[PDB]
Each structure stands twice: as C-alpha cells, then as structure tokens.
Design a protein around this ligand. Structure first.
Ligand code: ZEM
Length: 294
C-alpha cells in the first residue's frame, strides 16, 4: 500500500561491545572454514549476500532492502540469479544461534562488513537496528540485475537503488572478490588473482588485461583474458561507457580513493530504506581480529 517507514530500533540492551562480539564470531569462522570453494573461503559469498539482500530495495516504495531481513528466493536458490547464496546463509546460521538476539537484517549486512574488513578491505561504518519483519517478505524475483546487459542498463538499474555513476563503479570493485561459478549463474571464472583479498584489482584488470568476448560452457558470452580472468558483460560495460571509464581509471590509480568511496557506497547500500533516529547510536567501526590480537 502506501510507502512504509522503517525506523532503526537498537536490539534491546545491546551496545557496540555486543556487536563486536558478533563480528568476531563471523571473523573467526571465516578463518576456520578455510577450504570452502577451493580455498577461497566464505568472504566473497558473504559480501555477495549482503549486496544481494540490500539490492532488493526499491526507492520508489521503500520495499525490500536490508531492514526486514525476510526474503523469498526464486526457486529456492535453484535459479541463475540467486544460486550460491544459500552458502552464505548456511555459514551465518551457526552465528545466529550463538547470538539469537541479533536481527536477521543486522546479521546479513554485518556479514558483508565483516568479510570486507577481514579480507583487508576498508573499514565500513555499520549501524544496528534492523528489525525482522516476518509476514512482510520481499521476493527477489526480478529485483537484482542481469549480467548480460550494457552500460545503459547498469546505469538505469542502479538508479532504483539511488546510486550514481561513481557509486556504481565503486561498488562493482567488490568483484575483485570470489568468482562466478558455471553451475550457479551460468558464468565461470574469477575476476582476478587475489580472490580473497580486497584491493582495486578489478579496475586494473579491466584496463590492463587483453580481453576476448566468447561463449562459456553455458553458451553465455563473457570476456576472458589470457591470465585466466573473466568479466561479465556488465563489468566490461564500465570501460565501454566513457563516463564509467574515467572513474574506472581513477580507482585503478588510487587505492585509497577507491577504499574511501567503496566504504561510503557500501554502507549506503546496506542502509537504504532505513531511518535512523537523531538520537540513535553513532555508526560502529569494528576492529579486525588482527587489530585485537585475536
Ligand atoms: C551490475 C551489477 C551486478 C551484477 C549483474 C552481478 C552479477 O551478475 C554477479 C554474478 C553472476 C555473480 C556470480 C555468482 C556465482 O556464479 O556464484 C556475482 C558474484 C559476486 N558479486 Zn556481483 N554483480 C553485480 C553487483 C555486485 C555488487 C554491487 C557487489 C557488492 C558490492 C557484488 C559482489 C559480488 C561478489 C563478492 C561475488 C562473488 C561471490 C562468490 O561466491 O564468489 N556484485 N555477481
């Protein structure tokens, strides 16, 4: 019906310390389950999960987003759009059991933040307060982007998430992480060499590698390099469009700028649709396990 307002409500009696403990649990499990996906680890899929769940948001009616933490995935993950995400949810289940008080939305988004930081990425301010909304679920059907599209599609798509050119290019840098799996999305191959280390490699590879457009074993077109890397048509569109290209070059030449811009864009993504009271706690900046000597 009429647009609904989602006000962040801090989990009763919880403070920064409580959430750092959750972060630590996630970070410790990331370290422990090192063999997942041929030793890439769960970091990438957790970042994907955080993006996907938040990416369901629609600025027009404030439906979807990370707030409710309640979704209905098309074909129960047996669709090229969401196949693989169940791995992230399975990873987080034990965490939710250890900390039953945290909301699902807070857990899903915190998983993404934790993964980025533990993989040596930028610190990402994170705010608690998402409230589970069972009875009000968001189906992912047709809400996330297709990979077989061009720059115009990408630009238009992200306008629904209230993201501009710089925000879009910065967010896509997350593809430095993990890889596409043929059986999941119909695409196969990593975007770079350091699959579980957050860097600006995505942009360097786009600009420096020799790419060739060809069909994969699923008959889908993707760009492949002699180094064994790949780029989705949507990734490659970032260097075909002149406006996107300039930004790709900027991030390829300034690691710090990319980190700062990604940090802002990612927090924004995870917070879309959420209203934070003026007297709400300041954003939390969690310490990595390394910083805590853990
Ligand atoms: C144009 C927009 C996008 C499209 C079309 C798109 C996309 O089609 C796909 C596809 C097909 C896969 C491969 C799935 C598979 O086979 O397992 C995949 C995997 C991952 N992504 Zn991705 N992505 C967009 C935006 C963003 C944004 C924004 C992200 C976060 C900031 C972020 C993070 C991650 C990550 C980390 C992965 C790797 C997951 C893994 O399991 O390795 N993405 N992404």
């Amino acid at each position: 019906t009429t647009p609904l307002v989602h006000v962040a409500s801090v989990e009763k009696g919880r403070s920064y310390e409580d959430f750092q403990k959750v972060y630590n649990a996630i970070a410790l499990k990331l370290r422990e389950d090192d063999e997942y996906d041929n030793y890439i680890g769960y970091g990438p899929v957790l970042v994907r999960l955080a993006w996907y769940t938040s990416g369901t948001w629609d600025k027009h009616d404030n439906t979807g987003g990370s707030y409710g933490g309640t979704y209905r995935f098309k074909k129960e993950f047996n669709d090229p759009s969401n196949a693989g995400l169940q791995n992230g949810f399975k990873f987080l289940e034990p965490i939710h059991k250890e900390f039953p008080w945290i909301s699902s939305g807070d857990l899903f988004s915190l998983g993404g933040v934790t993964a980025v930081q533990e993989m040596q990425g930028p610190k990402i301010p994170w705010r608690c307060g998402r409230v589970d909304t069972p009875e009000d679920t968001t189906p992912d059907n047709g809400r996330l982007p297709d990979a077989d599209k061009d720059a115009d599609y990408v630009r238009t798509f992200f306008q629904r998430l209230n993201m501009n050119d710089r925000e879009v290019v910065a967010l896509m840098g997350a593809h430095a992480l993990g890889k596409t799996h043929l059986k999941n999305s119909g695409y196969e191959g990593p975007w770079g060499a350091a699959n579980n280390v957050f860097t600006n490699e995505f942009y360097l590879n786009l600009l420096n590698e020799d790419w060739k457009l060809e069909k994969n074993d699923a008959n889908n077109e993707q760009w492949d390099s002699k180094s064994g890397y790949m780029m989705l048509p949507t990734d490659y569109s970032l260097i075909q469009d002149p406006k996107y290209l300039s930004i790709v070059k900027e991030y390829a030449n300034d690691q710090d700028k990319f980190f700062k811009d990604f940090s802002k864009a990612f927090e924004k993504l995870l917070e879309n649709g959420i209203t934070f009271p003026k007297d709400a706690p300041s954003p939390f900046i969690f310490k990595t396990l390394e910083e805590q000597g853990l």
